[PDB]
Amino acid sequence: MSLENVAFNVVNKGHFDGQQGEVPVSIINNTVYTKVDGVDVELFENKTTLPVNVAFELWAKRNIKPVPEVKILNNLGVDIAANTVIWDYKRDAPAHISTIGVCSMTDIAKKPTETICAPLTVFFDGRVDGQVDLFRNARNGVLITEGSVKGLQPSVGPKQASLNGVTLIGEAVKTQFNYYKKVDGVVQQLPETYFTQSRNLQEFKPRSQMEIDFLELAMDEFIERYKLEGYAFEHIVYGDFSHSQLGGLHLLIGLAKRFKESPFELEDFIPMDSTVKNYFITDAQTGSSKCVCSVIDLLLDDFVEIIKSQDLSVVSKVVKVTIDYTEISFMLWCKDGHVETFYPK
Amino acid sequence: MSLENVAFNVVNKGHFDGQQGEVPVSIINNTVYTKVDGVDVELFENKTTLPVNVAFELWAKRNIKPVPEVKILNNLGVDIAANTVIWDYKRDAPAHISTIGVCSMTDIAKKPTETICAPLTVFFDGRVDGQVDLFRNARNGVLITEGSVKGLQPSVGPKQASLNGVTLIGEAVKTQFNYYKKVDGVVQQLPETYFTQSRNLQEFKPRSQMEIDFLELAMDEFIERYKLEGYAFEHIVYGDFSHSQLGGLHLLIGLAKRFKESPFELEDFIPMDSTVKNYFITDAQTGSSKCVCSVIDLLLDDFVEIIKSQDLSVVSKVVKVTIDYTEISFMLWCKDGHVETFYPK
Amino acid sequence: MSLENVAFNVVNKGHFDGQQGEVPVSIINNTVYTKVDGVDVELFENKTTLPVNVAFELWAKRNIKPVPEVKILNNLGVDIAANTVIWDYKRDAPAHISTIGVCSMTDIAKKPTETICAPLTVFFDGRVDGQVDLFRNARNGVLITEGSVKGLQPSVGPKQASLNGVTLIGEAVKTQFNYYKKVDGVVQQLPETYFTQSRNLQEFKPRSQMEIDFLELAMDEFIERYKLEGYAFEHIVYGDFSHSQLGGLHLLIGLAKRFKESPFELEDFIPMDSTVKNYFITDAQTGSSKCVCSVIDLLLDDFVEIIKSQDLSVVSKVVKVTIDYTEISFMLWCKDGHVETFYPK
Amino acid sequence: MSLENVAFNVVNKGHFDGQQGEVPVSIINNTVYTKVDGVDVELFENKTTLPVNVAFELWAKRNIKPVPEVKILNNLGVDIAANTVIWDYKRDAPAHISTIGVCSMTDIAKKPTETICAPLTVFFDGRVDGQVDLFRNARNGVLITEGSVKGLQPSVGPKQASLNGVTLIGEAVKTQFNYYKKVDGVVQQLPETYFTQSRNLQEFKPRSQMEIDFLELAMDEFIERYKLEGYAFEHIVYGDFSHSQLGGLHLLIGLAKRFKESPFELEDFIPMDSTVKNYFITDAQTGSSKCVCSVIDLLLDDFVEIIKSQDLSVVSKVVKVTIDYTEISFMLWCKDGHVETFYPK
Amino acid sequence: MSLENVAFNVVNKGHFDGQQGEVPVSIINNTVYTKVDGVDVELFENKTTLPVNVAFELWAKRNIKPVPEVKILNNLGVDIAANTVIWDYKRDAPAHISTIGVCSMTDIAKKPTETICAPLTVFFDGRVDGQVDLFRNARNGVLITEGSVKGLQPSVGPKQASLNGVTLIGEAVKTQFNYYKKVDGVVQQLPETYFTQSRNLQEFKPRSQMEIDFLELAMDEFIERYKLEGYAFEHIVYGDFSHSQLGGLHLLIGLAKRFKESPFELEDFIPMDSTVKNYFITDAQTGSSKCVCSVIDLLLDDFVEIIKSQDLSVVSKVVKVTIDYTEISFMLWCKDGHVETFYPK
Ligand SMILES: O=c1ccn([C@@H]2O[C@H](COP(=O)(O)O)[C@@H](O)[C@H]2O)c(=O)[nH]1
Ligand SMILES: O=c1ccn([C@@H]2O[C@H](COP(=O)(O)O)[C@@H](O)[C@H]2O)c(=O)[nH]1
Ligand SMILES: O=c1ccn([C@@H]2O[C@H](COP(=O)(O)O)[C@@H](O)[C@H]2O)c(=O)[nH]1
Ligand SMILES: O=c1ccn([C@@H]2O[C@H](COP(=O)(O)O)[C@@H](O)[C@H]2O)c(=O)[nH]1
Ligand SMILES: O=c1ccn([C@@H]2O[C@H](COP(=O)(O)O)[C@@H](O)[C@H]2O)c(=O)[nH]1
């Protein structure tokens, strides 16, 4: 292993591919350059808190197959990955602080069977040879596979996965994984869970007829068709832009509908991958704004199921919803048997 | 006050909100990070010339209500703000070098009544309690209010204001201010003035029928309808792209019309907020370019009034137009009683 | 806890003392400044690989009582300290990567009784209340005390200790500790050991009559008086400067004698605290030099005991000597029953 | 003015001398280089908080004649210098944040007669032509001269001054100045004052017979000869190294006597020029140490006068002594009519 | 070749030694670290203008045998070295900008026989096999050897050379070289030359009886013994400290004599190796100072020969003296047949 060999692979293979060779490398400030035909070409700018030459090596060795989105791994308590780097593209940094068998500066072990790895919840990838059996022996672990594992009940994960920073539902490649988890040598039954949909504002695409209806129909028409009167969708989902403080607007599909008609600014003041996102939102059309607007991307059909499964008889309470394998707390406010607002915290 | 408490407020409230608490903070190079669930998340990248921890505190304490655009405050001679930070989003830096009662590293005073503040033109905000009366006592000051001030004649400011970096005409919030100014204890009569419209190229929206006509009609049709023959609109407003040096094109609406049909590059080589902007422009379609193209965004109706109020009998002269409370100099070139060009300097 | 409060303590108490207060702080590049009467004064320059604000906090909280030299702790396998920072003054950095109950960015636990601390060999300091009993309960640990511990046999440590970076034999303060060690809940019997003396070239002071004799007597006289003929002291201790490659010179006292008569340069190319030190040495008088000259500071009486306890009948072999609780390997070369050279590796 | 012209003067004249010319300059990180015969030579490393090219210009234009030590100017309330830079060699930075007529980035005025300079206490140097008369007209100012000023009573300053960072009593050049001060146009009578002597530990030289006696005589002999029994010189001046906490040792001459016999470490944790200095002291011989040891360098004859002019009848009190034109507070502790300790704060 | 292999050699061999291996390396800012037993140890701090990883490689590959001082190579017009790095310890940087066969980022050729090397004056080292014959074939070159070269007349170089930054007259190693030079394929006759002695102030040691006499005798006694009256040694060599501007003092031995009696400060404002050095000198005893004091270190016997070989009949003139193979210009000032001053420029 060598910095110059890593650069050679990046230049010739697009990432670290284990090829032999070296190229000349310059490091100046926080950027790595290589000399290409007499001129310097930037290969990598370190945006991490690691040393530039270390971040470069971890970046070059990132996993380039579809992998679980980082929010899923965090929610499952994954501490470290077995013999790979999960690159966190939202943070432009490794998803995990340490490595196993990846890099001499960051390795805590060469193999996940060493004792130092035993207390950590290690992520194992059943697509790599041998890792399923390592999971059967590991004390703490999470395993994904594309198919069945003998003697283990799977929990079916989300349909989408991350490929080189692109979140997608795979058609030429499988992105739908079974999930398994062990704690202290004991296989866990992962809970029934909803999954977030991981869409974004500018390219929001509906994924069900109900979501199509939400984008196509007027507000009162949609709530009428699906008999959603009294659940405060006008506030919660569509948003209330009538006052200086922006009311509601907590579901991504609701932001998408407003955005497609009228633009607004979202300051992502904690920029990481998480099931619930908090934005400093400023509506450009009205001047309505809100410092902390919590936003979750559930499939609209799923959100309706959740809200229709709540008792509306109490002024305020916390509602727990298992999402992405974690319990998300929602604030439910009601008045006279109707929803006033309902937002994730 | 404390760096870690500022970070706590940013993480939990989107900005500094006076809440008690602390979170762990890392500073590496010119970026501030906080540790969130075992990983570092970037909270702020310093693009200012202040120390990173100082810029972070001023940024977190920026004013998040609608405030006058920085170009107005500069034109009014404002030196410093009373108990707030005006963040200059065009420069990504504070609009003013010093503060009053904001930050221990940058404070020159805790209250604007101290003698050190007397010679400075201090900006007071009548929406904050007590500040109107501070203005009545201050030696040098500018005061904005949303309504009347007893015994003071107001100057009506622009319709738009800046909210979290978004320039807008408020509908749910008031952005139209009265302006007052004192110099050496004496209230000034602010001059009659036009106002720039603060629009941008990509999202340019007409704001009058004349501007609608400009975008909808052909060049000769528009000049004919409003009887503008001989005022060189073909050159000044529409632009002349026939030669290697780009001719004219000095009004934003004229750039907008060309841009909507044909893209071009504008290098903003002095990136700050100012009434007149200078761009290094390169027309992609023709290759016509100009190193310094001065561009002003007046409402088209206002620009027509201005140019029709000039004598066209002289080869060249400087025309003074009060705009944004400042005197803008225009170059007027005429030949045989017609305009040849007319551009701001 | 807060950066500004740490700076307040540094300015007012010389280190972190738990006092309430704050001062204004600036961070620019890798240096921390505070404003003192209108000007900036540097408080700390980060020479560590930690973030500047983190290194500053660990530095301010360094232990300022006599503590074991870092080489002893390393040799004893200490991984982390209980509720203190051992500052490594040779590296100008913390001696240990993590902390317990010191600093939010670096803490792995608030108390050493947490499970995450169990596999680490934690250093406990019996001078601090409660820590002896924590040692009795800890799974892995090293404990120093100034006196007896009930039911535990002590190993008497070196006479000297480090106080604010000053290695000294205490007269007004106790620097002589008893040592105890536990591995997996079992108290260890620490081995019989020599100790290095931790002296330096420029201020080398003899500590026994034999060392006095070495500095005072001529080479042949000293070897004769203590009947050291055939042990190659002429080479090993005095040094051989007759060839382009410097021969021998492996004991600090031998460097001291040459240095007091004739100066030379020692490049400390791995600058850390360790029992054996390696120097790139250049003799200024002769031009004799050697890239790797291993140097150990044993009391001369101790080194004579060691070398007189070796068999000299073999051409070459590795000799193991327990020093500072670790086994130091020496290379022993002999010819015709006499030493040729003998140096630590 | 130009960066490259400044570098030309530095290379050819040792400082800025107003010569015409330019040399090639490179700025990389915080260091300025120039190319000299094909290689880069470092000219200046910025240790200030100013921009590297700005600090370089102020450094090159530093005053290279004898000037008052910075501690005197600070004590006199000087805010800024007229047409010069006082370089603060203890901080390796300008003594004053702003300049007058020195540097375009830092100038607040070109001449001290401008209104912006009126509220500042401006330092004027009577050796420069015209500055005495500027002082007669300035509202706030301090003036030094080498001789009489018509109609103004002088206060005789210290014998020593700073020349290129060297504090000296001039023999070939005059370092003894008259001082004058104006506040709001009114000449002040500067108070009777002692002066500190500005000596250092390693090169401490006695400057009176009493100081000679202190270094030459034994402790009891000296106190006896000058009849100083009961004034706790044994504690205050000689120092008490018998306990873990170092007792007393508050006069530089007392540190000098110990240091000449036995070395110790002084951590200067607030590194600036000031009348009273605070050190984190560790005595190497005994291990006695103290986190905050306040140290003042008075001429011993002066300190005896001060302490013999105090009432010793009270347990504890604050004693005010005018020194370097400022009031220094001393803590006086007495028991049964004798001094227990007496130290500056 | 590889960064990590270079670090391995540095850690294990003190410099680059061609050994196989790798160690983990971190680069942060301008410093290279390696992890040694769980902690980071600084290996190299870049003070050059090259990229940190490039400077590190050139530093590790520096020549560690005695080599000509850089001032000699510069004076001989050497542009580049054949298959080695001459490290310039005065500048802490490579003596030459480019390399031949050393480092991929800096190499301009792998062998000096390539056409790109033909116009450069390449330094060849006859101690390395094959390089003498390369010199016979090179178009432009300088060759040093320890002995005779067939068919070439040598010029005997200085007695001293640089070994790892230590300038010395070798006793165990040869530092006295023959010099040869070729320009456009033609061997040059190097001129008769004096050599500077390369001594320093603090450790100045006389090297002849005349120099011994200078240090031992009083000023008038020495000038009398060697009949030097009228050559202004009182001014030129001893220095004149009677006025605010320091007079004379242009020979290092003269600085040494003053320094041994009385200290002064020398600011080396162009820090590089050169035959003539310019210092900003401040005399601590008198306050006499001079911004540009040119200082040359000739053996006193040599300087007397030079000055006694000048005509003293003219007010002022430039005197050319071949020194270190270059022509040094001296200013000679005379009055009434005696020297007034005589200093190098
Ligand atoms: O985690 C949070 C906290 C607040 N809010 C929004 O901020 C306001 C909180 O009001 P209050 O409960 O502080 O009165 C509401 O508009 C709510 O939608 C969120 O979206 N998420
Ligand atoms: O402040 C300026 C200066 C120049 N120009 C443009 O640059 C050219 C100036 O020509 P001249 O007056 O230098 O000949 C014209 O095309 C004019 O529109 C501007 O827009 N603004
Ligand atoms: O760890 C080491 C390795 C080598 N040397 C010195 O370097 C030389 C090693 O020679 P060799 O055994 O490589 O032939 C000897 O002078 C020896 O003293 C040391 O001091 N320490
Ligand atoms: O400004 C200060 C404060 C304390 N000390 C020293 O620190 C100790 C203060 O003790 P106490 O008054 O806090 O008990 C004494 O040894 C005293 O000499 C100083 O020198 N200067
Ligand atoms: O290259 C130089 C230039 C000047 N000086 C010194 O500076 C002064 C130059 O005076 P002047 O010839 O500028 O009058 C003299 O003291 C002279 O010794 C040098 O040493 N070297």
Author numbering:
A (entry chain A), B (entry chain C), C (entry chain E), D (entry chain F), E (entry chain D): 1 to 345
What does the article say, verbatim?
Here we present a cryo-EM-derived atomic model of the hexameric endonuclease Nsp15 from SARS-CoV-2. Biochemical experiments with recombinant Nsp15 have established that it preferentially cleaves RNA substrates 3′ of uridines, and therefore Nsp15 is commonly called endoU alluding to its cleavage specificity. Each Nsp15 protomer is composed of three domains including an N-terminal domain (ND) that is important for oligomerization, a variable middle domain (MD), and a C-terminal endonuclease (endoU) domain that shares homology with other endoU enzymes. More recent work suggests that rather than functioning in viral RNA synthesis, Nsp15 nuclease activity is important to evade activation of host immune responses.
We characterized SARS-CoV-2 Nsp15 bound to a UTP nucleotide by single particle cryo-EM. The cryo-EM reconstruction of wt-Nsp15 bound to UTP revealed a hexameric assembly containing six protomers of Nsp15 (designated as P1–P6) with D3 symmetry. While we used an excess of UTP when vitrifying Nsp15, we modeled uridine 5′-monophosphate (5′-UMP) into the active site because there was no observable density to account for the β- and γ-phosphates. Thus, our cryo-EM reconstruction, recent crystal structures, and previous biochemical work support a prominent role for S294 in uracil base discrimination within the Nsp15 active site. H250 and K290 are both within hydrogen bonding distance of the 2′OH of the ribose. The active site arrangement suggests that similar to RNase A, H250 functions as a general base to activate the 2′OH for nucleophilic attack, while K290 stabilizes the deprotonation of O2′. In contrast, H235 is set back further from the ribose and is within hydrogen bonding distance of the phosphate ion that we modeled into the active site (top).
